[PDB]
């Protein structure tokens, strides 16, 4: 099956809880092993003591640079970049988990959870899962950004794994 993975977040050391994903190897399996395997940091790297960086309200939660912290980076385990997989899963609402990019074929570590319908990326943006429980996690760190993107306290990704 699909695998099932979690995020243990927390805001200026403080847990806010845990978000569980599927992630849909059935459809998009090269995007959705990449994100597996920085969850378990099974090849030596990967999301654990990284943040979330950029959280817009009413838009979306972005995390994943976990080389410069900032936006700028992050690499995925087959190298730099990879490509655009497919783009047959769509942004249908709130708890979407689609790859951030740089454009076209740029994919490496960075994702974002949807608070939002965000229609507007379909077919720029890899969708490759979705929250199964702590939608109300994502709510309490989409609390702590701005529309600027900068966030008020400091969201770490504590811990992550793979459940099934
Ligand atoms: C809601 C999604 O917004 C984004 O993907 C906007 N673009 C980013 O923040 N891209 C930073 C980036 C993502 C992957 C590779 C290098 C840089
Ligand atoms: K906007
Ligand atoms: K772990």
């Known amino acids: 099956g699909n ?15 845990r978000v569980v994903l599927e992630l849909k190897a059935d459809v998009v399996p090269k995007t959705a092993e990449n994100f597996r395997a920085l969850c378990t940091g099974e090849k030596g790297f990967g999301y654990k003591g990284s943040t979330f960086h950029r959280v817009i309200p009413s838009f979306m939660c972005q995390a994943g640079d976990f080389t410069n912290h900032n936006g700028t980076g992050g690499k995925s385990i087959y190298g730099s970049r990879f490509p655009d997989e497919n783009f047959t899963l769509k942004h249908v609402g709130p708890g979407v988990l ?19 319908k965000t229609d507007w990326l379909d077919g720029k943006h890899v969708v490759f899962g979705h929250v199964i429980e702590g939608m109300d996690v994502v709510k309490k760190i989409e609390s702590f950004g701005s529309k600027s993107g900068r966030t008020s306290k400091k969201i770490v990704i504590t811990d992550c794994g793979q459940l099934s």
Request: aromatic share 8%.
């Open 98 to 116: 689609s790859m951030a990019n740089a454009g076209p074929n740029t994919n490496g570590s960075q994702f974002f959870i949807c608070t939002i």
């Open 3 to 17: 695998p099932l993975v979690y995020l243990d977040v927390d805001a200026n050391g403080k847990p806010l809880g």
